[PDB]
Amino acid sequence: NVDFAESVRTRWARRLIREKVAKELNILTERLGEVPGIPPPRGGYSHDNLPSDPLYSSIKPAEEELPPRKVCIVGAGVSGLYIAMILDDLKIPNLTYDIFESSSRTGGRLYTHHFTDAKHDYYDIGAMRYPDIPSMKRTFNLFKRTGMPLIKYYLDGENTPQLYNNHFFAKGVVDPYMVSVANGGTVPDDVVDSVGEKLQQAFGYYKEKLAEDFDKGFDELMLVDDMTTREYLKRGGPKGEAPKYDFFAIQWMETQNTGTNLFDQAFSESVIDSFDFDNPTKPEWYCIEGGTSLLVDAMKETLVHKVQNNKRVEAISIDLDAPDDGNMSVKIGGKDYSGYSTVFNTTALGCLDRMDLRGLNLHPTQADAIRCLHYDNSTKVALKFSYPWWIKDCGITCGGAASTDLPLRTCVYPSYNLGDTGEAVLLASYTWSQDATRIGSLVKDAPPQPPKEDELVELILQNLARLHAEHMTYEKIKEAYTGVYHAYCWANDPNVGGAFALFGPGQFSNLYPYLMRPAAGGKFHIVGEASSVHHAWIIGSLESAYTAVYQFLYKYKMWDYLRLLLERWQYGLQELETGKHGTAHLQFILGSLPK
Amino acid sequence: NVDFAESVRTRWARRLIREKVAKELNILTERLGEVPGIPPPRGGYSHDNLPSDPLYSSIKPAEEELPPRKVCIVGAGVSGLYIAMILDDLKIPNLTYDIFESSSRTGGRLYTHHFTDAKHDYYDIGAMRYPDIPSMKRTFNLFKRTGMPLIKYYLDGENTPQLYNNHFFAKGVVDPYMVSVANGGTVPDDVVDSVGEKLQQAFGYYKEKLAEDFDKGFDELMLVDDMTTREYLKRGGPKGEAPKYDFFAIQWMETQNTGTNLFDQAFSESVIDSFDFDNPTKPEWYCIEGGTSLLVDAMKETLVHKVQNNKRVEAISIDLDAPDDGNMSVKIGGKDYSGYSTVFNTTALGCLDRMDLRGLNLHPTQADAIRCLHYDNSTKVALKFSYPWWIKDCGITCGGAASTDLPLRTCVYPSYNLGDTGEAVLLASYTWSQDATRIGSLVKDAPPQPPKEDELVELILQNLARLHAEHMTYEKIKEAYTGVYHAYCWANDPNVGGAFALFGPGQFSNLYPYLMRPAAGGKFHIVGEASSVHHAWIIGSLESAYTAVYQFLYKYKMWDYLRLLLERWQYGLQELETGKHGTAHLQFILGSLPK
Ligand SMILES: Cc1cc2nc3c(=O)[nH]c(=O)nc-3n(C[C@H](O)[C@H](O)[C@H](O)COP(=O)(O)OP(=O)(O)OC[C@H]3O[C@@H](n4cnc5c(N)ncnc54)[C@H](O)[C@@H]3O)c2cc1C
Ligand SMILES: Cc1cc2nc3c(=O)[nH]c(=O)nc-3n(C[C@H](O)[C@H](O)[C@H](O)COP(=O)(O)OP(=O)(O)OC[C@H]3O[C@@H](n4cnc5c(N)ncnc54)[C@H](O)[C@@H]3O)c2cc1C
């Protein structure tokens, strides 16, 4: 048995599915009376009373029979590659696939940039760090399968500076930044040095409720599911007997919040997220020695069918006049590619919304889920210096990250070059949201002609000097700078359009059931991190792929290989609720309805 | 006398100033007891009881005496040019100025792109339309002063298509898009065809309160000042006895909302905004024949001192060790420019936050106001066709704008080429927020090499065909396309960083008093649309400039030219509350405090 803290996210997700399916089943039994796949008897359905799987008798463990089939994988990020890897391992007779990549590059949001092919001469533009928590079992299994060299990622370093209001942070000092009301600021005195615990308090109130009675706690959490984290703090709602915080208190919390947007996401999932690290929040973090793109390389090279880059799918369709399995097609550069029995789309939702999907006959609400989700921006700037001055001169010897209200916002000291004494890469700027958009405005796809330094480099070098002024001069940093740098803004990437999906108030609880269920007669799948309760991480991408493969096997009643899937590829807690009294078959049925 | 509807925005803004000043005065009288500029007597101060202007006896109407002074204007957008125009007209003896422009282009968010120098061969990337409402008096005066050729802007056209859920809009049809619950959708049946009135209802409830008792209404509006428009609709708060709307209802409202973001701004200013057009909302709209940049041209050419382009200010400072007037300086490309008695900064706040402002010794809360405000993204795509097929084939003969859930979102039919039969420009895509970021990801600063068509053009042409499918084929539009197009995304512009400031919940009421008040001993001014209650429009930019010039004249006690300013340059309702019992002098004093 897994303890409560590690089980709540999955229980939460599964309950959300049941809530939606029950309403849609009631509605359809009140819109058609009969539902294809069920035997309706006589509002009726509810979240803890849904029909059993009528096909379960075939799923109990207890050559060329399978007709030749071909599936299409849209996207060669980690989700698409994982689908292909699973399919390869299952070795389904006469089953083949095409995997199309829009970019010339494979990997998607797994993206290491190499300045040279020198050992440590890189930086990760996408995913870079991985926590050893139980929800990440599937991820670390993939690392094992592909033989990834894992090293320690230092989240908290030594002597990393913090700079706000042009004051450096100092331990055991009341309001070191001098921004509190007592020192002529507007930040409330009870908040300025206690941001972390006020937040933990707000979440802890609902974590405590869920702990002793989940359903009761779930019902209470639903009352704040329709509000942002900022809103909850600005109301203490919904009643609200919870502690209030004025405008400047919350603004200071947001200021101190570097990293992805939290205050504009649903408070309910902010609460769920605080369970993620309650084994507790001192697990070990890991990164891949040589860059995350080593995973991409290992995965794409073991594929039975090679990734086709520079193939941008612009339309997806199904021919319902044709009774055969392979009646689906995609359009690439004006050319039709047909004969597919299933299409897995693994792109970011913005990319999918850009396609012509009329041929799929998607229901408007599912089309909404694809269109309406926002993506959080992220930008990275990396600079090469002739020596690691932060290690040697500043005493920053074990990674970590600096924080400031300066434009660069965060400076990340690499965990993979701690012993180097020569040329060294620094992740000088790591930003999110509006900060990332601002730095991104300075990042141009066509770099300046050597050796001219543009506004971005000049801004970063100046910010770095002020941030490390306790040990470094601006002159010294400029001299140490080799003239080599690279930068990347994800919202400017047409193939992705942001770091990862942001779920606003009510968006996950209402749209996640739609993103997870099949379409086009159970032949179309929306795959990717955003389609999973484990979103914004690799695990979400990997779990979504596993889920979609399940529903694909279920669609064509390949019970032998469905069982094989459950034996070989089930890691951690399974997101999809399968079994006789599960909901996977109901999502399948709702996603396979005729027209 | 002006009627209530046209006075509420100014009364609202002036009251917000009084609320903040009263708190800061009480605080400072509880932090220092004495305040430089006042004679404190003995919590005490309140919004309707603030000290009179001790210098008013000099301001009542009732050669070279003025020492030589020089001021710096940062930014050659419409705000900076307007400052220069006012200064020129006042002809203050021995007063000169430098105006520095970061871009090679003058005009900022006034930006017409000319494909050729042909008569109608352009499109406006920034501001383009201007409503004849009383708040716009200052704007139309500027148009008159510069001799702008005004023509009719058609907001609502004829036969403009609307496309949602792949259904075209049709009058007198219940749920034409088929997205309501009754037709298997999730949009509530009472909302789907009545979005406009449900919104008007929500605002009308508070507009009604303000109408009969402003202060009482103001106090009630403050209770919803800390919530978004979406939040208010999702709560009916704050009590809340107001009508509720579920997730899909509000999502449909947002979907139908093309144009700038509204649902994430404060509900309080959403209410105030609904007064903007209550003379009512059928005023005439105007645009400038030949493009908005004609205004920029007229303004910059009449300037006594020519705009210096390619001059990016990277730092602003004041020398408090020096008792002389001109003790301020700016840094441009590593070079110091000194001798300034006042600096007017007119840049977008993101640009100002990018500067080194340590030499100004800004108070942390004012620095917050500069840093924390978000900007709404906007993107435009314009295409040239060999003939105006929308006029000739589609019957769209009087401008207007199409609306769709397709990627291009809105298609604007130009009001300045209605009679043309040959080559014609179409504003094929006009987007905001996340939509603008997505289209913007396809807009690259280095265009494709002729005559290759990139993903953006292909996407737009396909969307245009579906949008105008009632009269046009995709083939026909492709043939009509000349191969010439241009696109621009404002969040990608490092000199601006977005369309205009977005004021989230609580942000205007709390930060506007800081953005409006001087700094650095009353010698530094934050100027621009975001510094005004009339923000996101040209009037806000123009009113901010006028306000800053007032405080500049007041700082150096130039009463002769201060009076001249009030006689010649006072248009519409004055935002800044001046007079004996005003608050301008208190903002000045709070903004001139020593260190
Ligand atoms: C900056 C950043 C930091 C992160 N940090 C971490 C971290 O520390 N740890 C962690 O576990 N996760 C992290 N994440 C998230 C993680 O990287 C993602 O969840 C995951 O990589 C996404 O995988 P995916 O295959 O679902 O989507 P993607 O990687 O986006 O794959 C989609 C692919 O489809 C392609 N595509 C798009 N449009 C089309 C089209 N029309 N036709 C064909 N192909 C198309 C794209 O090019 C892309 O390659 C981070 C992400 C980012 C951006
Ligand atoms: C797409 C769009 C549509 C709009 N629609 C309308 C409309 O229909 N009607 C309407 O009235 N208004 C509209 N607005 C708003 C209006 O255009 C603006 O309010 C106004 O033009 C902004 O003027 P400004 O001088 O305050 O700022 P800006 O125009 O931004 O001027 C600031 C200047 O400072 C410069 N600068 C930046 N950084 C530096 C630096 N470090 N050193 C020196 N200079 C620097 C910039 O290049 C810029 O030129 C629209 C705006 C946009 C973007």
Numbering used by the authors:
A (entry chain A), B (entry chain A): 3 to 44, 51 to 70, 79 to 611
What's written in the study?
l-Lysine oxidase (LysOX) is a member of the LAAO family protein and has strict substrate specificity for l-lysine.
A single prLysOX molecule is in an asymmetric unit and forms a dimer with the neighboring molecule related by crystallographic two-fold symmetry. prLysOX consists of 617 amino acid residues, and the final model contains N3–R44, G51–A70, and E79–K611. The propeptide region consists of an 8-turn amphiphilic α-helix (F6–L34, αN), a proline/glycine-rich region that forms a repeat of turn structures (G35–P62), and a loop with a short helical segment (L63–R72). Unlike the precursor of PAO, the propeptide is far from the entrance of the funnel leading to the active site. αN is inserted between the helical domain and the FAD-binding domain. The N-terminal region of αN pushes up α5 and α6 resulted in straightening the kink between α4 and α5 and induces a movement of α9 to form a tight hydrophobic interaction. The movement of α9 changes the shape of the active site. D289 and F293 in α9 move away from the active site.
